[PDB]
Design a protein around this motif. Structure first.
Motif, PDB file in Angstrom:
ATOM      1  N   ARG A   8       8.206   3.824  15.379  1.00 23.21           N
ATOM      2  CA  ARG A   8       7.507   4.666  14.415  1.00 23.21           C
ATOM      3  C   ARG A   8       6.424   5.519  15.069  1.00 23.21           C
ATOM      4  O   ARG A   8       6.222   6.668  14.661  1.00 23.21           O
ATOM      5  CB  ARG A   8       6.917   3.815  13.286  1.00 23.21           C
ATOM      6  N   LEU A   9       5.718   5.004  16.083  1.00 21.71           N
ATOM      7  CA  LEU A   9       4.565   5.732  16.595  1.00 21.71           C
ATOM      8  C   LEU A   9       4.702   6.232  18.029  1.00 21.71           C
ATOM      9  O   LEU A   9       3.955   7.141  18.411  1.00 21.71           O
ATOM     10  CB  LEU A   9       3.290   4.877  16.452  1.00 21.71           C
ATOM     11  N   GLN A  10       5.615   5.684  18.837  1.00 18.33           N
ATOM     12  CA  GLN A  10       5.845   6.265  20.157  1.00 18.33           C
ATOM     13  C   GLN A  10       6.575   7.597  20.067  1.00 18.33           C
ATOM     14  O   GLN A  10       6.519   8.398  21.008  1.00 18.33           O
ATOM     15  CB  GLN A  10       6.620   5.284  21.042  1.00 18.33           C
ATOM     16  N   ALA A  24      -0.545  11.000  10.224  1.00 16.83           N
ATOM     17  CA  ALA A  24       0.619  10.120  10.173  1.00 16.83           C
ATOM     18  C   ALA A  24       0.452   8.938  11.119  1.00 16.83           C
ATOM     19  O   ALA A  24       0.750   7.794  10.757  1.00 16.83           O
ATOM     20  CB  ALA A  24       1.886  10.905  10.508  1.00 16.83           C
ATOM     21  N   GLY A  25      -0.030   9.195  12.336  1.00 19.46           N
ATOM     22  CA  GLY A  25      -0.315   8.103  13.250  1.00 19.46           C
ATOM     23  C   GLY A  25      -1.403   7.185  12.730  1.00 19.46           C
ATOM     24  O   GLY A  25      -1.356   5.971  12.934  1.00 19.46           O
ATOM     25  N   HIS A  26      -2.401   7.755  12.052  1.00 21.69           N
ATOM     26  CA  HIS A  26      -3.447   6.941  11.439  1.00 21.69           C
ATOM     27  C   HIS A  26      -2.868   6.031  10.363  1.00 21.69           C
ATOM     28  O   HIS A  26      -3.231   4.854  10.271  1.00 21.69           O
ATOM     29  CB  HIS A  26      -4.537   7.846  10.864  1.00 21.69           C
ATOM     30  N   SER A  50       2.142  -6.414  25.337  1.00 18.19           N
ATOM     31  CA  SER A  50       3.296  -5.793  25.975  1.00 18.19           C
ATOM     32  C   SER A  50       3.757  -4.532  25.257  1.00 18.19           C
ATOM     33  O   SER A  50       4.618  -3.822  25.787  1.00 18.19           O
ATOM     34  CB  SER A  50       4.449  -6.794  26.060  1.00 18.19           C
ATOM     35  N   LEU A  51       3.215  -4.241  24.077  1.00 18.27           N
ATOM     36  CA  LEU A  51       3.613  -3.080  23.287  1.00 18.27           C
ATOM     37  C   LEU A  51       2.510  -2.048  23.113  1.00 18.27           C
ATOM     38  O   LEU A  51       2.786  -0.849  23.174  1.00 18.27           O
ATOM     39  CB  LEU A  51       4.103  -3.528  21.905  1.00 18.27           C
ATOM     40  N   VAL A  52       1.264  -2.473  22.900  1.00 20.38           N
ATOM     41  CA  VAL A  52       0.179  -1.532  22.646  1.00 20.38           C
ATOM     42  C   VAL A  52      -0.690  -1.299  23.880  1.00 20.38           C
ATOM     43  O   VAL A  52      -1.451  -0.320  23.910  1.00 20.38           O
ATOM     44  CB  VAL A  52      -0.695  -2.006  21.461  1.00 20.38           C
ATOM     45  N   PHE A  53      -0.587  -2.148  24.901  1.00 19.35           N
ATOM     46  CA  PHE A  53      -1.412  -2.025  26.092  1.00 19.35           C
ATOM     47  C   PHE A  53      -0.608  -1.905  27.377  1.00 19.35           C
ATOM     48  O   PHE A  53      -1.204  -1.726  28.445  1.00 19.35           O
ATOM     49  CB  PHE A  53      -2.363  -3.222  26.207  1.00 19.35           C
ATOM     50  N   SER A  54       0.717  -2.001  27.311  1.00 22.12           N
ATOM     51  CA  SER A  54       1.528  -1.968  28.519  1.00 22.12           C
ATOM     52  C   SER A  54       1.484  -0.589  29.167  1.00 22.12           C
ATOM     53  O   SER A  54       1.275   0.430  28.506  1.00 22.12           O
ATOM     54  CB  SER A  54       2.973  -2.354  28.202  1.00 22.12           C
ATOM     55  N   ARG A  55       1.678  -0.567  30.486  1.00 22.10           N
ATOM     56  CA  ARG A  55       1.707   0.694  31.216  1.00 22.10           C
ATOM     57  C   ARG A  55       2.945   1.524  30.904  1.00 22.10           C
ATOM     58  O   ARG A  55       2.983   2.706  31.264  1.00 22.10           O
ATOM     59  CB  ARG A  55       1.627   0.433  32.721  1.00 22.10           C
ATOM     60  N   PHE A  57       4.804   1.752  27.532  1.00 18.86           N
ATOM     61  CA  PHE A  57       4.696   2.411  26.233  1.00 18.86           C
ATOM     62  C   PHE A  57       3.494   1.889  25.458  1.00 18.86           C
ATOM     63  O   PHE A  57       3.553   1.698  24.239  1.00 18.86           O
ATOM     64  CB  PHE A  57       5.980   2.242  25.417  1.00 18.86           C
ATOM     65  N   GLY A  58       2.381   1.657  26.152  1.00 18.75           N
ATOM     66  CA  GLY A  58       1.173   1.191  25.509  1.00 18.75           C
ATOM     67  C   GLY A  58       0.408   2.311  24.831  1.00 18.75           C
ATOM     68  O   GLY A  58       0.826   3.468  24.793  1.00 18.75           O
ATOM     69  N   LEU A  59      -0.753   1.948  24.287  1.00 21.00           N
ATOM     70  CA  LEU A  59      -1.591   2.894  23.563  1.00 21.00           C
ATOM     71  C   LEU A  59      -2.927   3.159  24.236  1.00 21.00           C
ATOM     72  O   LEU A  59      -3.468   4.255  24.089  1.00 21.00           O
ATOM     73  CB  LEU A  59      -1.849   2.392  22.138  1.00 21.00           C
ATOM     74  N   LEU A  60      -3.476   2.181  24.958  1.00 20.64           N
ATOM     75  CA  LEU A  60      -4.649   2.459  25.775  1.00 20.64           C
ATOM     76  C   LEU A  60      -4.284   3.323  26.973  1.00 20.64           C
ATOM     77  O   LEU A  60      -5.113   4.104  27.451  1.00 20.64           O
ATOM     78  CB  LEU A  60      -5.300   1.154  26.229  1.00 20.64           C
ATOM     79  N   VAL A  61      -3.049   3.198  27.466  1.00 21.64           N
ATOM     80  CA  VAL A  61      -2.524   4.134  28.454  1.00 21.64           C
ATOM     81  C   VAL A  61      -2.286   5.516  27.868  1.00 21.64           C
ATOM     82  O   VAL A  61      -2.077   6.481  28.621  1.00 21.64           O
ATOM     83  CB  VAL A  61      -1.228   3.568  29.068  1.00 21.64           C
ATOM     84  N   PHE A  62      -2.342   5.648  26.543  1.00 22.02           N
ATOM     85  CA  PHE A  62      -2.211   6.950  25.905  1.00 22.02           C
ATOM     86  C   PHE A  62      -3.622   7.543  25.971  1.00 22.02           C
ATOM     87  O   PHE A  62      -4.220   7.920  24.960  1.00 22.02           O
ATOM     88  CB  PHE A  62      -1.630   6.767  24.485  1.00 22.02           C
ATOM     89  N   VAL A  63      -4.203   7.519  27.170  1.00 23.44           N
ATOM     90  CA  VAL A  63      -5.341   8.353  27.534  1.00 23.44           C
ATOM     91  C   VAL A  63      -4.947   9.062  28.823  1.00 23.44           C
ATOM     92  O   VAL A  63      -5.171  10.266  28.980  1.00 23.44           O
ATOM     93  CB  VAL A  63      -6.653   7.549  27.659  1.00 23.44           C
TER      94      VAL A  63
END
Length: 142
Positions: A8-10, A24-26, A50-55, A57-63
DNA sequence: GCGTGAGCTAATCTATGTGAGACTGATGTTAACCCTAACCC
């Protein structure tokens, strides 16, 4: 919470015209996190990292994957508001994958040139909120 | 003695603009050093 978070969000940070769909992401990140109220065997503590922080498809890597996205650097800020207050659950003694999340937060500090009271002062409460609940493993933090 | 929710006003907080202090380098000006129309002994 839902396993379909990746689907849904990647997809959001894959298409052009990033102006828009930030709301939408919010909505997606609010839906994945409204389920955080449950406390009877969440079984997602090891799943989120492994999903929101992984290198991969993580989300903190989405910086690092948001640097070129200036239009998705304040929208990224606004979603990561909730993504970073997501850690607000001080009822667990678990400490899995905290070592790398420490330097991930450090990278988040040393990434954004703006929103300095919005992305910072919103990170680094992992310190003094999540870390320093420690001195049982303490391999790298100090 | 004390929690808990609503409304508010104080406190930001960044984008943009303006000025003060420090700095830097191209430039033109004054000046040291010598040469030159011209005559005329």
């Amino acid at each position: 919470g839902v396993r379909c978070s990746l689907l849904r969000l990647q997809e959001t940070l894959s298409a052009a015209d990033r102006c828009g769909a930030a709301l939408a992401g919010h909505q997606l990140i609010r839906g994945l996190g409204q389920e955080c109220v449950l406390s009877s065997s969440p079984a997602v503590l090891a799943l989120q990292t492994s999903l929101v922080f992984s290198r991969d498809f993580g989300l903190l890597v989405f910086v690092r994957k948001s640097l070129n996205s200036i239009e998705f650097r304040e929208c990224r800020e606004e979603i990561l508001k909730f993504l970073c207050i997501f850690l607000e659950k001080m009822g667990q003694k678990i400490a899995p994958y905290s070592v790398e999340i420490k330097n991930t937060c450090t990278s988040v500090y040393t990434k954004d040139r703006a929103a300095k009271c919005k992305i910072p002062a919103l990170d680094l409460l992992i310190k003094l909120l999540q870390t320093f609940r420690s001195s049982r493993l303490m391999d790298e933090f100090k």
